[PDB]
Amino acid sequence: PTTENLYFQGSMNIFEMLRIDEGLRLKIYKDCEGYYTIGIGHLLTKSPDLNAAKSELDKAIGRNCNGVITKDEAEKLFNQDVDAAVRGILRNAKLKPVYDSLDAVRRCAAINHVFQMGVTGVAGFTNVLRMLQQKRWDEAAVNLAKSRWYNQCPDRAKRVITTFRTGTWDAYKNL
Ligand SMILES: FC(F)(F)c1cnc[nH]1
Numbered sequence: 001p002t003t004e005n006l007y008f009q010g011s012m013n014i015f016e017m018l019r020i021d022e023g024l025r026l027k028i029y030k031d032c033e034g035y036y037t038i039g040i041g042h043l044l045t046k047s048p049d050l051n052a053a054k055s056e057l058d059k060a061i062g063r064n065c066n067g068v069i070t071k072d073e074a075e076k077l078f079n080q081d082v083d084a085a086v087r088g089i090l091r092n093a094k095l096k097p098v099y100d101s102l103d104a105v106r107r108c109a110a111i112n113h114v115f116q117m118g119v120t121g122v123a124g125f126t127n128v129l130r131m132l133q134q135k136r137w138d139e140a141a142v143n144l145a146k147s148r149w150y151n152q153c154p155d156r157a158k159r160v161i162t163t164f165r166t167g168t169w170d171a172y173k174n175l
Pocket residue numbers: 089094095096098099100102109110111113114122128129132
């Protein structure tokens with residue numbers, strides 16, 4: 001590893017991680033599952049009605065957006081969503097102990113996973129949660145790769161899975 005390579009981990013954090021997995025879009029679009037989304041992975045609604053999505057957007061941003069936001073607005077919303085995922089983990093009796101047991105990089109993978117799937121979805125992964133607490137990294141990763149979350153949209157989830165396996169940022173290098 002070069003001096004530069006060793007600096008790479010200090011450039012990576014949960015925000016940079018999700019930014020790569022979710023991308024950045026300033027106009028309403030449909031995600032890999034066909035749900036209306038904007039910014040950095042902000043799910044507006046699961047309704048097929050675009051009108052509902054725009055309504056949710058205006059509520060989320062606080063102005064008349066007509067389906068379009070600024071980069072600064074995308075960032076503020078993203079920060080709010082990241083905070084909600086972290087808070088969702090820490091208050092949950094099932095997820096908190098697992099999260100506490102993890103190293104810093106795998107903690108980012110945990111927040112990412114919750115950001116993507118929500119608290120109850122993640123908390124339902126009983127075997128994976130046990131495997132992670134027991135440092136059974138390869139088993140955890142194989143089991144994550146069986147999930148509908150990963151399988152229906154692999155490109156959004158693949159790096160998170162690799163990150164649970166290795167506890168390094170390697171999956172986010174060389175985009
Ligand atoms: F429990 C958490 F939050 F650490 C976790 C999230 N995904 C797997 N584990």
